[PDB]
Amino acid sequence: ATKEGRVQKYAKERFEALGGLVRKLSYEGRSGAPDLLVILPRGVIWFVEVKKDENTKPDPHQLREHERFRKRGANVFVVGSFKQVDKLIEHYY
Amino acid sequence: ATKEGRVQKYAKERFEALGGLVRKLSYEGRSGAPDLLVILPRGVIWFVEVKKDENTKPDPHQLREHERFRKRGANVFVVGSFKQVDKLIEHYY
């Protein structure tokens, strides 16, 4: 697809293999929502932003939105390659 | 505003008074997302659907989506009056 699209599809497949529900998120009347909402068993909720490669940072409005979430304790992760998806699961799940 | 709009605004204000971040949610290319994502301190995540009155049930696609979330342990609540917002906070927070 697109590079970003391929990483997103892999992530979706890995999370669904763990029993997770994956949704593509957007906000009504606001930008900056994380690309994926991931609902994993036992009430684990992850918000995952997907980028095209490991050197691509999220844009400024995205970064401020991730920090608003994390200040309150929410799980927000950024991945930009298949390896990063694999490390996220290994280390955080 | 609309009845549903007034309850939604009250809910937003009550959650923001607890330190919460409130967002109006939508999905890309899918319907049925809960009306509100609420991120409360200490990583508490609530999805809240708001209706115009206490007798209005969510539509069928919404109900199936709430159950997909709750099967995995997520917090999904439906409120349709100011009193229900108040009871939700009293009982669940």
Author numbering:
A (entry chain A), B (entry chain A): 2 to 94
From the paper:
However, we were able to solve the first VRR-Nuc domain structures using single-domain proteins derived from three bacteria and bacteriophage as surrogates: Psychrobacter (psNUC); Streptococcus equi bacteriophage P9 (stNUC); and Salmonella enteritidis typing phage 3 (saNUC). Crystal structures of three representatives show that they structurally resemble Holliday junction resolvases (HJRs), are dimeric in solution, and are able to cleave symmetric four-way junctions. DALI searches show that the structures with greatest similarity to the VRR-Nuc domains are all Holliday-junction-resolving enzymes exemplified by Hjc. As dimers, bacterial VRR-Nuc domains have two active sites and a DNA-binding surface with 2-fold symmetry that are well suited to the recognition and symmetrical, bilateral cleavage of Holliday junctions.
saNUC was solved by molecular replacement using the stNUC structure as a search model, revealing a dimeric arrangement of two molecules in the AU essentially identical to that seen in the stNUC crystals. Despite only having 34% sequence identity with stNUC, both have core structures that are remarkably similar (root-mean-square deviation = 1.3 Å over 86 Cα) and the orientation of active site residues is essentially identical to stNUC. By contrast to the other proteins, saNUC only formed nonspecific, higher-order complexes. stNUC and saNUC exhibited weaker nuclease activity against the Jbm5 HJ substrate, detectable only at protein concentrations above 1 μM and with increased reaction times. Under these conditions, stNUC showed robust activity, whereas cleavage by saNUC was much reduced. This suggests that our saNUC preparations have a low active fraction potentially also explaining the lack of structure selectivity seen in the gel mobility shift experiments. Whether the levels of activity observed for stNUC and saNUC are representative of those in vivo is unclear, but it would appear unlikely given their close structural homology to psNUC. Crucially, however, both enzymes retain the ability to produce symmetric cleavages within a HJ substrate, an activity that is not characteristic of VRR-Nuc domains within the FAN1 orthologs.
